[PDB]
Amino acid sequence: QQLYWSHPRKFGQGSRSCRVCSNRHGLIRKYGLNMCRQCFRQYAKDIGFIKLD
Amino acid sequence: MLMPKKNRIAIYELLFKEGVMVAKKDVHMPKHPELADKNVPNLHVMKAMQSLKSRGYVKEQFAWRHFYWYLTNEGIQYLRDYLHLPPEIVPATLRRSR
Amino acid sequence: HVAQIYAIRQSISKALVAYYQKYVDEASKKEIKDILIQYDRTLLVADPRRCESKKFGGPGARARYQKSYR
Amino acid sequence: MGRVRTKTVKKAARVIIEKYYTRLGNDFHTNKRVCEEIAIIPSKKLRNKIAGYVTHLMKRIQRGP
Amino acid sequence: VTVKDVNQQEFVRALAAFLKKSGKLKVPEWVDTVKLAKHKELAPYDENWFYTRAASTARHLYLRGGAGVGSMTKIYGGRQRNGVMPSHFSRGSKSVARRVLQALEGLKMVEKDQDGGRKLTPQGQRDLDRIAGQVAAAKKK
Amino acid sequence: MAVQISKKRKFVADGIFKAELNEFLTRELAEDGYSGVEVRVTPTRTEIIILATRTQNVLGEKGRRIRELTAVVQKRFGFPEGSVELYAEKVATRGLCAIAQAESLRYKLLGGLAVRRACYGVLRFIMESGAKGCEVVVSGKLRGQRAKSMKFVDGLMIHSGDPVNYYVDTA
Amino acid sequence: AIHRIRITLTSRNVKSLEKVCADLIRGAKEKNLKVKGPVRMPTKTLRITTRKTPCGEGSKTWDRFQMRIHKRLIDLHSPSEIVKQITSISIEPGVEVEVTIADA
RNA sequence: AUUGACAGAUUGAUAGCUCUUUCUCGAUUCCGUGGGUGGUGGUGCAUGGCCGUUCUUAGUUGGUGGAGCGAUUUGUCUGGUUAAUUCCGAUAACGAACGAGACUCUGGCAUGCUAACUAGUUACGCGACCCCCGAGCGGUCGGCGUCCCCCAACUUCUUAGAGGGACAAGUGGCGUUCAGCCACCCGAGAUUGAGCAAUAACAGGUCUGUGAUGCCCUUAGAUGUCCGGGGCUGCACGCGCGCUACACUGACUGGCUCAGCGUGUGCCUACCCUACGCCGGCAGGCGCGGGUAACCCGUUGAACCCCAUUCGUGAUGGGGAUCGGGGAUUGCAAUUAUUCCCCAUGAACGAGGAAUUCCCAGUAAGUGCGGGUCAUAAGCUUGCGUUGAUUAAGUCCCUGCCCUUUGUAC
Numbered sequence A: 001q002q003l004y005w006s007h008p009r010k011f012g013q014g015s016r017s018c019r020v021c022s023n024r025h026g027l028i029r030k031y032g033l034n035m036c037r038q039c040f041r042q043y044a045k046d047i048g049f050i051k052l053d
Numbered sequence B: 001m002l003m004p005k006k007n008r009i010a011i012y013e014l015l016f017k018e019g020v021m022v023a024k025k026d027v028h029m030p031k032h033p034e035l036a037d038k039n040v041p042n043l044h045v046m047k048a049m050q051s052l053k054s055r056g057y058v059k060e061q062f063a064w065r066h067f068y069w070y071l072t073n074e075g076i077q078y079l080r081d082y083l084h085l086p087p088e089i090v091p092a093t094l095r096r097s098r
Numbered sequence C: 001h002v003a004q005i006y007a008i009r010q011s012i013s014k015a016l017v018a019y020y021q022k023y024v025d026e027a028s029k030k031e032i033k034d035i036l037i038q039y040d041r042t043l044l045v046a047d048p049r050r051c052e053s054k055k056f057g058g059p060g061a062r063a064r065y066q067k068s069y070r
Numbered sequence D: 001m002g003r004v005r006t007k008t009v010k011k012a013a014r015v016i017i018e019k020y021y022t023r024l025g026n027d028f029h030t031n032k033r034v035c036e037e038i039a040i041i042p043s044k045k046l047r048n049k050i051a052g053y054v055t056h057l058m059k060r061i062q063r064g065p
Numbered sequence E: 001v002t003v004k005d006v007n008q009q010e011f012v013r014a015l016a017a018f019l020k021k022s023g024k025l026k027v028p029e030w031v032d033t034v035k036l037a038k039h040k041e042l043a044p045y046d047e048n049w050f051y052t053r054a055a056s057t058a059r060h061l062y063l064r065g066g067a068g069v070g071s072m073t074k075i076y077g078g079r080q081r082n083g084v085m086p087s088h089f090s091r092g093s094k095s096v097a098r099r100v101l102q103a104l105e106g107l108k109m110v111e112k113d114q115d116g117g118r119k120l121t122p123q124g125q126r127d128l129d130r131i132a133g134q135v136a137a138a139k140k141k
Numbered sequence F: 001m002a003v004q005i006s007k008k009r010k011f012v013a014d015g016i017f018k019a020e021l022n023e024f025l026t027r028e029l030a031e032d033g034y035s036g037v038e039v040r041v042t043p044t045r046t047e048i049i050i051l052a053t054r055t056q057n058v059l060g061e062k063g064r065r066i067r068e069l070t071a072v073v074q075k076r077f078g079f080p081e082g083s084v085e086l087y088a089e090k091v092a093t094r095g096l097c098a099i100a101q102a103e104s105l106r107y108k109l110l111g112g113l114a115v116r117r118a119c120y121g122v123l124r125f126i127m128e129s130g131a132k133g134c135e136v137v138v139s140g141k142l143r144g145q146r147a148k149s150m151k152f153v154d155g156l157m158i159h160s161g162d163p164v165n166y167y168v169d170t171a
Numbered sequence G: 001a002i003h004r005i006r007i008t009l010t011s012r013n014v015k016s017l018e019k020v021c022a023d024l025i026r027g028a029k030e031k032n033l034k035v036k037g038p039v040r041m042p043t044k045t046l047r048i049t050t051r052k053t054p055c056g057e058g059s060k061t062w063d064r065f066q067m068r069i070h071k072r073l074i075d076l077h078s079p080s081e082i083v084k085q086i087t088s089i090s091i092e093p094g095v096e097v098e099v100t101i102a103d104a
Numbered sequence H: 001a002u003u004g005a006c007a008g009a010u011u012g013a014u015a016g017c018u019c020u021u022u023c024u025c026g027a028u029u030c031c032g033u034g035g036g037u038g039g040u041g042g043u044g045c046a047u048g049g050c051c052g053u054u055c056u057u058a059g060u061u062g063g064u065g066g067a068g069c070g071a072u073u074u075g076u077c078u079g080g081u082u083a084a085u086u087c088c089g090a091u092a093a094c095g096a097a098c099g100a101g102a103c104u105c106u107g108g109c110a111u112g113c114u115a116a117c118u119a120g121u122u123a124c125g126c127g128a129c130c131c132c133c134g135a136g137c138g139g140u141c142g143g144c145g146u147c148c149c150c151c152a153a154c155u156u157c158u159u160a161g162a163g164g165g166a167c168a169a170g171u172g173g174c175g176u177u178c179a180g181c182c183a184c185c186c187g188a189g190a191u192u193g194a195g196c197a198a199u200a201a202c203a204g205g206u207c208u209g210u211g212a213u214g215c216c217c218u219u220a221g222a223u224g225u226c227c228g229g230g231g232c233u234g235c236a237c238g239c240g241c242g243c244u245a246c247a248c249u250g251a252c253u254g255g256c257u258c259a260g261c262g263u264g265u266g267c268c269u270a271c272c273c274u275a276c277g278c279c280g281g282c283a284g285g286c287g288c289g290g291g292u293a294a295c296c297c298g299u300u301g302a303a304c305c306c307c308a309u310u311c312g313u314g315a316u317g318g319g320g321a322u323c324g325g326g327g328a329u330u331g332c333a334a335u336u337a338u339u340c341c342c343c344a345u346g347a348a349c350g351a352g353g354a355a356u357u358c359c360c361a362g363u364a365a366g367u368g369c370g371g372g373u374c375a376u377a378a379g380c381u382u383g384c385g386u387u388g389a390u391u392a393a394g395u396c397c398c399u400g401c402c403c404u405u406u407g408u409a410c
C-alpha cells in the first residue's frame, strides 16, 4: 500500500517536470520557467521573451 | 455514491459552494489545495469529477495539466437531490452585477 | 595589461593636449598635436575595434566547428 | 563598390525635387533638413539617403536638364 | 617615499629578510612538509618561503585593506593542470594564508578590522614604508 | 507573505501567468468568439479584460459564465477573493483579428462547408473588413489520404523585416 | 509631514516606462517640492538560448531569446497623500511601480 | 452484495501479494455487454505544428494588353551598373506584388543635453583621522586606507534616456560625363556584426515536446502504473566531434599584475550565491554576517602574459594515461572506481601516410571566466572578455552556385 509512491522524488529529472507538456527532458529551469524547451518556444512571445538577435 | 463517504460528500459540497472546481492533474497530492479538511487528496476529487462528467453532471476544460470544472444545470440538480438540499439553495451564480 | 597601457598612453597625451587648449594657447596645442600624430595617430584617436561576438556553430565568431562528412 | 540607392530613394528624391526645387539646394545639410520638413519620412537613414540623391540631382540640374 | 613608489618584486625580498632578521614571526611545524595549494605539483624551492609569503601578504594589505583568508586564497590563486582534462583556477591554501595572517597578527604588523578581514596596522605601516625607503636608497637604477 | 521575489523572476513569472491564462481562455472561449486577454494589475485589484466578438455568449445567462471563470481564475492561479474580475469587451472590427478568423474558419471546417469555399469566404471577409492584405493556409489531408495544402492569398503582404513583428497579425 | 519617500518603476518596455517617470516628475513639479531625476539602473537582459528544433536532427540552430528589464527610480521629500495622488495617475501599461517609505 | 486486514509461514520487501485467522466502509462491489481510459506502444510514407534543407543565393508572381491550335511565352531584357531582378537605360508592353534593400538589435563618435547615497564620487575643501605613514632639522609635499555626512562641486570615467551624427556629402580621376567605380580630405568612409527573411518544393526530421492528432495495436496474467534489482557505461574491432600532449618560445617554484558577459535563496514542491572568523596539509568542517541584488558575493584582485627560479635536450623535472593505498563531501543509496583531495604508480606519444577541416580583423589561434544541464557536475555546448598574428583583397583550376544562348533519345 504505502510503497506505491515511496521512492524519494526530491531531485533530478525524475522529480522536476514541465508546467505544460509535463515531459522531462529539456526543462528551461533558469528563471523558474520550468517548461519543455519546445513549450518555451511555443509560449515565448506571450511569456515576454523575444528574439531581437 | 462511491468509495469513502466523508471525502466524497465533502467534494460534492465544495462543488456546490463554488459553481466551478479545479484540480491539478497530479495523482500524488496527499492534500488537495483548497478543501484540505483531512487528507482528501487530489484524486478522489479527480476521479469523482470524472464520474460527474461521465453521467453528464459537470462540464470540463483541461488546459496546462490542471482541470477546470464548470458545473451544468442538470449537474446542480443532481447535487441538491444527493445532498438533500432545499429548492432555494443558491449554488454560486447569484452575484449583483451593477 | 597591454590595453590598459595603451589607454593611459592615449590618456595623458590627450590630456596634455586638453590642458594646452583650455589654459595655454591653441597655437601650442596644434604644435603638440602635430608632434604626437606624426609619430602615431593612436596617441589621441581611439581604436574603435573591440572583441567581435561569437555566433554558435563554432568556437568563435568567424571560425566554425569541424565538419565530418563521410 | 557597394552603395547603389534603391528606387525608394530615387523616386522620393525625383518627386521631391519636382515639388520643391526652390527650397532645395546644393548645400547638403540644409536640404537634408528640408526633406524632413516637406516630406514625411519614417526613418533617419532613408531621410538622410534621399537627401543625398537629392544633392546628387541638384548637381545635375545645374548643368542642363 | 612610500611603498607604492617602489618596484614591488625587490620589495617583498627585503621585507621577508626584514621579517627573518627580527626572528619572531611564527613559522608553523609543517612548513617543510606542506605543498602550498592544490595547484602545485611540489612544495617551494625557497625553504624560507613563509617569510616571503607573509611579506607579500602584508604588502598586499598595505595596498588593499580588510582582506580575510578567502581574500588571500583568491589572490594566491592560479592554474590547475587537471592532466588530461583542461585547466582551471584553483584557490590557494586556506591554512597557510590563515597562519600568515595570525603570524602577522602576533607581530602587530596587522590587526582584524571592523567589517571583517585584516588591515595592516599603524606600527606595521611603519615597517613596510620604512623598507620602501631602504630600497629607494639602494641606488639610482 | 513577505517574499518579494526577484525582478528577473517576477517579470518572467507574470508573463507565464498571462500566457497560461490566454491558453485556458483560447480553449474555453474559442467557439464563443474569443480574440485575446489583456491583464492589468491595480491597487488591491486585478482587472483582466477578455476580448471577444460574441460578448453576450461569454457573459452567459443573466451573467453566469464570467462568474464561473472568475471563480476558476481565483481558484487556480491563487488569487484572494475579490482581487480579480473578468471584463468582456467587444472587439472593434472582428475581421482584422487573425485568431478570430482562424477560429471562424476552424468552426466552418468542422461544420462541413468545403475547404475551398469556407476559406475563400474568410479571406473575402477580412478583405472587406479593411485589411492591407492576407494569407490563409490550410494544410493536411484535403480530399484523399495524402497530405497537401491550399494557400488562399490576396493583396499587400510582408514577411521579412522587423515591420512584420507589428504590421501583420498571425494566427 | 516630510519623510524621504522613494518611487521605483520597472518595466519590460522602455517608452511606456519613460513616459511614466516623466508624468511623476511633472506631478512632483506641479505640486512643487523636490525629486532627484529618474535614476537609471543598468538594465538587465534575461537571456535564453534554445535549439530551434524539437528533436535533434537538422543543422543545429539556436533561438537567442531576450527579455530586457528596465529600472528607473526617483527620490522625493513629501507626505503620503501627495504621493498617492501622483501614483494613482500613470497606470494602464505594464510598469511595476514600487513605493518605499523612507531610507530603506 | 462482498471495498479494506497485526500473525506466522512465504517473500526481496515492515508487497494483507498469497495460505491460516481477524474482523470491516456499509451500498462500496463482482459479471456481462455496450463502452471507456491510458500507453516514451506501431505508423513521420495517414496528418497538424515546429524545425532543417533545397538556397544564402537573387530570386519569385499573377492583372490587363501583345505572341502562339496549344503546353507556354512576353513583361522578368542587348548593353553598362551593382552585394542584390540593385540601379541606369532599351522596350508589346503598362502598371503592380513578394523578396533584396529600408527595418530591428548591436558596435564604435559625442568635456553637448537630461541624470543620480543601489554610479562615480570628482577634482576640491583636505573637515579630517592616523600614527612618523613617509621625504624632510621643521614647514611644504607624496601615498593611499579610508572616516565622512550633507546645509561641498560637479558629471571627465558610470549608468541609460532623448537627440545628434555619414549621405559615397566634399575634392580629384574614370564612366554615354547617367547608374556608378576608383582615389584622397575631413572625420567612423558607402562595408561593425547579428536578427528577420520570397515562390515552389523534400514523401528530410519529428507520432520519445505537447491534454496537437487519424488509423492500427494493447488494455488487468497489461504495451497503464508503481516498487526492487539490473542495463543503456557491457569490448577481437571500424569510424565521427572532442581534450591532453609530444617540451627549453618550455617545466616547475615563488613574485608582480589587468577583464568582460552573466548568475544567485526565501521557488510549481525544497532548496541558492556566498564575505568574515576559527578547525584541517587538502578535499572539506564548524561558527556567525550580507544579498530577491549597480545595495552582498564583488575594486568579481582570472588565466595566458610579465618578473626572478631551477632544470638542461636525456621519453628529461616534457606527458600524465594505467593502477595500489588512504582520506573528504552529494546522496535514500556510489560496488562497474558520482565527484573531490593526498601519496605512490609513471604507459603511448620525439609534430603524425594517403586524406581532409576551419578560417581574412580585434578575425585565426592561444587563454581563462560566465550561462545551459546541475543533490552530486564538463573533455560538450551556449555566451563573455584577455592576449593577439601570417596571409588575400584575387580567380574560376577543383568544389559548387546565379543568369544567357545551345544541344538533349533525360
Ligand SMILES: [Zn+2]
Residues within 6 Å of the ligand: A018, A020, A021, A022, A036, A038, A039, H210
Ligand atoms: Zn508543452
